[PDB]
Every structure is written in C-alpha cells, then in structure tokens.
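Deliverable D4.2, example record:
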Amino acid sequence: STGSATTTPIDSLDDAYITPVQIGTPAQTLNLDFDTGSSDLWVFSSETTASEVDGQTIYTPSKSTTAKLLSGATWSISYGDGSSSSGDVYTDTVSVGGLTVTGQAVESAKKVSSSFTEDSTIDGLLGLAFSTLNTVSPTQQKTFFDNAKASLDSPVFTADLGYHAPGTYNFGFIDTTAYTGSITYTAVSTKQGFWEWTSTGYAVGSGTFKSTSIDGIADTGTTLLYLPATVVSAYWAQVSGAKSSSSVGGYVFPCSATLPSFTFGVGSARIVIPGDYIDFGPISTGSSSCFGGIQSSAGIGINIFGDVALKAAFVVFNGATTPTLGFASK
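Output generated by the structure prediction step:
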C-alpha cells in the first residue's frame, strides 16, 4: 500500500504545516501537525477541557463505531518549546492520504497547554519519530508509520515541505518526479528515539564550505533551524545590523536586509536554504526588527534541522531495519 497527502502551511510564515487525517467511522477529518520529532498521535477531542478548546476541530470517539477505549492507558507529553498535553487513549481506524491503519492509538486530550489552545489551525499532532518515544502508559503504543510499515510497498515516508506553499507527505514510495538530481542517504542513530544524523558542514552565502560534523535531528515539528552558536554567529555576522536579543529570544535583523543563503552538507552533497526562507518577519506587528530563521541550539541540548532546513529539500525517512535519511535538492 501507499498514501499521499498534501500538507499546508498554517500561516504566512510557515510556522507549521497541517495535513488532513481521517479518524474513525464514519470519518472525522482533523488537521494534524506531522511531527518527526515526537511519537504520539494526539487530538483535540470531546474530552478536552472546554475552556482549552478555541476553534479546533475535535475527535468524538462516541460517534465512531470503530473506536474502543484502550482501558487504563494514559499519556502525557511535553515538547521542546514548553508546550504540553495529556489525556487517555482510544484505538480507532486512521487514514492518511488513502493509507489506512486499523487499531491505531489515538490519544485523546483531556488537557492542552495555552499554546495549543491559541492555535486554532492545529487539531493535534501525528508523531513520526521512533515508537520508543511514545508516552502512553502502561503499554507504549506504536506510531502510525510503525503500524503501517509492514503493509507499505517500501518502508519509507517522505517529507516535501513547501516554502510559503503546500507540499506533500508520501508513505510507502519515493516520488522520483518530486526532486532534482540524486538522493544522498546518510546514517541515522535511533538511540535517542529521533531521526538523528550528522551533517558534514555548512557555508554562509557564497562563502567557502566549512567541513565540520554537526549532529542533529530531522524534525518537521520544529519551525526553525537550530545549530551551534559558532555556526549561527558566522551566519548572522554576514547581515548588517543583525544581533542576538535576549529580550526577544534570539537573533533579530533589520527587516530592510537581504539575507544570504545557508548551505548544509549531507555527505558530499549540499542543500541550499535560500535567504528568504530564513526571514520570519517582524518581531511584533509593524516592527522593523525581523526574527531570524537560524537560531542557536545552545541550551536545547541538541541541534534541530527544523522546517527552515527541511523545506529546502526532498527528505526520505527510511524505516528499513537499519534506518537512514535521504536528502535531495528540488
């Protein structure tokens, strides 16, 4: 089997991407944030505290003839940005772009943090990291991908995120029309439960490439590119007037600037992030200070190849017995 679904930016900045997901019988379609940095499929639901729901579409398990309470199971998750959610668990039929999994754990939120409430466009998350990170207790549950894997034509999914435009998540096949040149594959460590890999270096604008190993995670659920402070300083030093602002929470730059590109290495290959991808706009409405899309990972404890990086590439998440990651230009 295969699946193919369009993923759409939630706003004009590509702060996140939502993908329609069919849950239950008859189908209830929710727009979920596909997140290769976590491993829970959780939704706003009829069980979510009413004051914490503000415009989201909810899953109502009592209206699904295929829903079953997973008795005794609970979940609770906290994300790198300080947001969180928790609740109980149902199993139900879940379909993405024509690919159907029966018996998928659908984690129903009883509580969500304010960041989730305030984002009316995201109805929940669909985790695509390794199932070892799934938070369901006392019986850990598998991700949608893990459940689908054996049925897929090939045990892969691909992320093709758009810049200020829709893109695609495919399951079970590689669309050879969706990228240019060849795909370069690189080793993955699953030891921390992430799609963790090592970039071979970087360049700023038309500058020379610096060969240096940068361990980090491919994370579709993180907006920005978080890299070591040395790398980030070298980038922003090429933008007149750019500075790190402790009050704003990262590098800012004059909105009048033209940003240089940023290149990262994948083996001997190179992925170029255009300068425009690195512009996240005014820090507040009407400001002439703009927020940068490359930020320091210092104090995160890990480097994160988030959407800023991934949307410059066609990315293969290869879930074969020994997982790997592939990157192509597009």
